[PDB]
Design a protein around this nucleic acid. Structure first.
Ligand SMILES: [Mg+2]
Ligand SMILES: [Mg+2]
Ligand SMILES: [Mg+2]
Ligand SMILES: [Mg+2]
Ligand SMILES: [Mg+2]
Ligand SMILES: [Mg+2]
Ligand SMILES: [Mg+2]
Ligand SMILES: [Mg+2]
Ligand SMILES: [Mg+2]
Ligand SMILES: [Mg+2]
Ligand SMILES: [Mg+2]
Ligand SMILES: [Mg+2]
Ligand SMILES: [Mg+2]
Ligand SMILES: [Mg+2]
Ligand SMILES: [Mg+2]
Ligand SMILES: [Mg+2]
Ligand SMILES: [Mg+2]
Ligand SMILES: [Mg+2]
Ligand SMILES: [Mg+2]
Ligand SMILES: [Mg+2]
Lengths: 53, 187, 56, 52, 125, 147, 128
RNA sequence: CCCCGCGGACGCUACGCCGCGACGAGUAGGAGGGCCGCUGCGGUGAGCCUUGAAGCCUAGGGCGCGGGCCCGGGUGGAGC
RNA sequence: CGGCGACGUCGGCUACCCACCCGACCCGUCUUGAAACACGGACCAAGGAGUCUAACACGUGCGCGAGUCGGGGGCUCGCAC
RNA sequence: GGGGACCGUCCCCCGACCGGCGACCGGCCGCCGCCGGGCGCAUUUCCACCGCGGCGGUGCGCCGCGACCGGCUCCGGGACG
RNA sequence: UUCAAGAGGGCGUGAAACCGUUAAGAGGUAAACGGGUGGGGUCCGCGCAGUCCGCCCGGAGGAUUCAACCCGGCGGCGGG
């Protein structure tokens, strides 16, 4: 089936298919400092309905 | 009751990809988080493009990308396309390009890399510019499809230049009556 | 005219309409005017920052 | 009898599927999720000598 | 990768039970036995599971080592805690918290250990 | 998959999506392209102008091989040879220009769409267009003819 | 005596009767299973007063008390002991019940294991 | 520079969970969802079953807005 | 905060029978209009009706991409699959 | 026609420097945690029981009562301008 | 006789329509139906002095041993 840097020698036109996402580690990508520097702070407070008195 | 109309309540738009591709869904998760948690509008545009269908993500050729990246002030910027980058054999000189694409044709990739360029996926683009700073967001020709030749006013109306649907093209196929003044009329 | 009854409200009418049944169109939503901050966020740029300003 | 029983798949698609299946056969979570009792297997890409 | 493998097994798995509007997952190292990314006991580089001991007393705390991810034979280290309930819970708490070893499962493991020990003490009349 | 179709959803609805008034009858309006000049005239004139009538000369026993003549444009001309050919020609100190035989690659006529790089080249073809020949000569090339 | 759930809210059922099919009273060939009337003149479909009511989404149960037994638990069907252990960490919200085709000797063991695990069984004395 | 306490609920099937606001007629017709239902095939449940399958009966217990479903008792006798 | 609690009573709005008040014309269908003095329908069981092929058009998903496609043929102990 | 030269990709090596030991791993150390065995044998620790014990959560088998708070609402008195 | 004739030669199971008998209830506006209650009946609830469990206090009892150190094993993290 070939390497990514050499085609298959027993299929005459085939090469391994390419990834559209090199690093699929979503957790590492999100925890990375470069992503975290660009974010706004979380809005983790819940604002429930106020009973109109 | 209230006096309102409900025929426009539901807005028709992609809220997610119709694709079940797990890598696409993973980078959709990534850019969904980026769009929510940053103020950048680049991330929102990229996310809504990731939702889109294939006809709404037309391929971008190497020549068109080079032409758009040669414009003044775009030096050392990352060309971002949400779609496939296609080799154009009509060009001979490939400059050094930094490129981020959803897909790259094998020949286009080899040409870009031997020209000294760099290719990134969208997770790498998120790690490189999380807000999309220093990017040129490109798009392939959306109306560069055969169906848009048939779309429009009907072929048999005056001042319409829309292609008709014919099984064959020849002097016997839809050329006589309604096409020339000698056979009835032309319009 | 056949579909409405209208007239000239007085100060007490304006007060009671705003205070008992006053709701704001905030971000396209019907939000009860339970805090002056709701008025000040939307109409503060016009000098209206409280229910008294709105009533005036 | 002429119901079009057969389908033709692109060779590139079929090769893609083979590659995906091979890649997934080397991840213990996916093999365990197919339910294959790979618990004392010393190495999931399990390779044995040619004398077999 | 955990996210990639989760996208594969989130709905197609032999451990999946979808029944009575409920969803359960029965892989060996799943605390709370729920079909979830956080609690899946197969897709992560480090997992912790609490099981009843081989005999009818104690618990087994099994944690996934770091190196042999593709070698399931040696990938899990199991230890047996056969002490009183408070010391057992303290031991599990120290395994998870002090090691910084996946601290989002600390209370799940403590509660599962409590359930196991409570099931091991004799039934009443 | 028949389980994905409207017929599964139309169970219980009496008319099966075809209306109670006009119903689903056998062939209201005719069969095939019936009445294309009588009661489907608006459709035919609107979407297929030129449908009716004869135009031009008929020719019995047309042999398409006789008129077979595929074409290639000047912007794709350099793709008929290897990359090495063009690179060596560009860096060649002498005036030696490579030969591109488009007949070998499977084209007979060379059309002149696009521009050429500034490299002399000898092009062999059965036919040329005026602008293709002009553009080949403007880069210092030559056009030779084959039969 | 019985194991009690985590919380015991008041279950409010908007409707307690079944929706019977129109004219299922007049015929044996028509079962009481609900079918939407689609006749051009049907008064049940047109919603005339005093007629058979039509099921619609407004009758939906509160999502906090939906699928909830009168005991306060939610049932989960089990066919063996291994399926029973999935409720170990859901003792106080979900109750197991043994499938109808599980043999008597095997459901005895399931009942014993559920007693050990403090899992409530809705049919604990069912083949004996 | 946390330490007499070494400790601190839940969560996040991200196709998930949460919040807020407005709204809810419908033939013909269109669309979506269906952990609605039937039969067969590939996988999977170290699934169920002569200590009793299917089917059928039932003033039995329930769940779901509903399509329907689960469980008890009986009959049945080999598969689901 | 009170009362009551095993062979008599306690709870179970669902489920069986019955009573009463209010409401309630027989469905399907064609029709501007059906409860119709319009038609079909005594009852029950089982069966019973948008399918397959070909050709187009647009939409969607996938692969490759100025290419793409082996579908016809051929090669691999000829054949449990 | 061969055999060569060159070019482009490759496959292994000899090697110096560069980023990192990484989600490719071992050895040493340092910290931490766990387990097993000793020592520790009592103001420590753990186990089960009792009190109609206190504090927390859920909640009372059934039938009921009261209180205050808040939301909505319909009324009634009194007083001021 | 048989496991079973509640398998007895058109005999596996044995639905509905329809019919006989038994039991309960009812009955001058043909029956039947929707909503709301009530009465009776059949069943269900291990109903019948009514839940558990975390900590602390007190009392009455047991037992290895609690911490800390020593040895060994195994992991997590870091290391120019
Ligand atoms: Mg409407
Ligand atoms: Mg309709
Ligand atoms: Mg008509
Ligand atoms: Mg109901
Ligand atoms: Mg009926
Ligand atoms: Mg009508
Ligand atoms: Mg409304
Ligand atoms: Mg509606
Ligand atoms: Mg009719
Ligand atoms: Mg008429
Ligand atoms: Mg009618
Ligand atoms: Mg009449
Ligand atoms: Mg008549
Ligand atoms: Mg008629
Ligand atoms: Mg008939
Ligand atoms: Mg008749
Ligand atoms: Mg039928
Ligand atoms: Mg028998
Ligand atoms: Mg018989
Ligand atoms: Mg009878």
């Amino acid at each position: 089936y070939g390497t990514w840097r050499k085609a298959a020698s027993l299929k005459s036109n085939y090469n391994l298919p390419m990834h559209k996402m090199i690093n699929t580690d979503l957790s590492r990508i999100l925890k990375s400092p470069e992503i975290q520097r660009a974010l706004r702070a979380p809005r983790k407070k819940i604002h429930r309905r106020v009973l109109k008195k | 009751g209230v006096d309102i109309r409900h025929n426009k309540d539901r807005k028709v738009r992609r809220k997610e990809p119709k694709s079940q591709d797990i890598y696409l869904r993973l980078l959709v998760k990534l850019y969904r988080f980026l769009a929510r948690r940053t103020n950048s509008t680049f991330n929102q545009v990229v996310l809504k493009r990731l939702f889109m269908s294939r006809t709404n993500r037309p391929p971008l050729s190497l020549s068109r990308m080079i032409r758009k990246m040669k414009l003044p002030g775009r030096e050392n910027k990352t060309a971002v396309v949400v779609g496939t980058i296609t080799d154009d054999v009509r060009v001979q000189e490939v400059p050094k390009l930094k490129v981020c694409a959803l897909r790259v044709t094998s020949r286009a990739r080899s040409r870009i890399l031997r020209a000294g360029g760099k290719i990134l996926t969208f997770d790498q683009l998120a790690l490189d510019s999380p807000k999309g700073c220093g990017t040129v967001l490109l798009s392939g020709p959306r109306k560069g499809r055969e169906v848009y030749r048939h779309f429009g006013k009907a072929p048999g109306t005056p001042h319409s230049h829309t292609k008709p649907y014919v099984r064959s093209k020849g002097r016997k196929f839809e050329r006589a009556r309604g096409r020339r003044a000698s056979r009835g009329y032309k319009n | 005219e056949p579909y409405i009854a209208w007239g000239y409200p007085n100060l007490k009418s304006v007060n009671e309409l705003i205070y008992k049944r006053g709701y704001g169109k905030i971000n396209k939503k019907r939000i009860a005017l339970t805090d002056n901050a709701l008025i000040a966020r939307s109409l503060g740029k016009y000098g209206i920052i409280c229910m008294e300003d709105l009533i005036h | 009898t002429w119901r079009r029983w057969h389908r033709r798949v692109n060779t590139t698609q079929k090769r893609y599927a083979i590659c995906s299946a091979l890649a997934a056969s080397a991840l213990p979570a996916l093999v365990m999720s197919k339910g294959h009792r790979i618990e004392e297997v010393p190495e999931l890409p399990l390779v044995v000598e040619d004398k077999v | 990768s955990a996210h990639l493998q989760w996208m594969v097994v989130r709905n197609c798995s032999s451990f999946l039970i979808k029944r009575n509007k409920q969803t359960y997952s029965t892989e060996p190292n799943n605390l709370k036995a729920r079909n979830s990314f956080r609690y899946n006991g197969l897709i992560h580089r480090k997992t912790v599971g609490v099981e009843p001991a081989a005999d009818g007393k104690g618990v087994v705390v099994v944690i996934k080592r770091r190196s042999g991810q593709r070698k399931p034979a040696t990938s899990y280290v199991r230890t047996t805690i056969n002490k009183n309930a408070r010391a057992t819970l303290s031991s599990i708490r120290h395994m998870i918290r002090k090691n910084k070893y996946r601290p989002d499962l600390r209370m799940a493991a403590i509660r599962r250990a409590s359930a196991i020990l409570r099931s091991q003490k004799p039934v009443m009349v | 998959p028949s389980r994905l179709r409207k017929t599964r959803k139309l169970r219980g609805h009496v008319s099966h999506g075809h209306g109670r008034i006009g119903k689903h009858r056998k062939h209201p309006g005719g069969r095939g392209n019936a009445g294309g000049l009588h009661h489907h005239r608006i459709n035919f004139d609107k979407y297929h102008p030129g449908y009716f009538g004869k135009v031009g000369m008929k020719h019995y026993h047309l042999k398409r091989n006789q008129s077979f003549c595929p074409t290639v444009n000047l912007d794709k001309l350099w793709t008929l040879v290897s990359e090495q050919t063009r690179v060596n020609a560009a860096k060649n100190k002498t005036g030696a220009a490579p030969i591109i035989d488009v007949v070998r690659s499977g084209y007979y006529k060379v059309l002149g769409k696009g521009k050429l790089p500034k490299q002399p080249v000898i092009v062999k073809a059965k036919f040329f267009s005026r602008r293709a020949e002009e553009k080949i000569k403007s880069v210092g090339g030559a056009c030779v003819l084959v039969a | 005596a019985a194991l009690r759930p985590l919380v015991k809210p008041k279950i409010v059922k908007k409707r307690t009767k079944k929706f019977i099919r129109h004219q299922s009273d007049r015929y044996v060939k028509i079962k009481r299973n609900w079918r939407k009337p689609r006749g051009i003149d049907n008064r049940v479909r047109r919603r005339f007063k005093g007629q058979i009511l039509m099921p619609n989404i407004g009758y939906g149960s509160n999502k906090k008390t939906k699928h909830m037994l009168p005991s306060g638990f939610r049932k989960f069907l089990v066919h063996n002991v291994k399926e029973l252990e999935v409720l170990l960490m859901c003792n106080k919200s979900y109750c197991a019940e043994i499938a109808h085709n599980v043999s008597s000797k095997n459901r005895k063991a399931i009942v014993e294991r559920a007693a050990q695990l403090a899992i409530r069984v809705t049919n604990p004395n069912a083949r004996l």
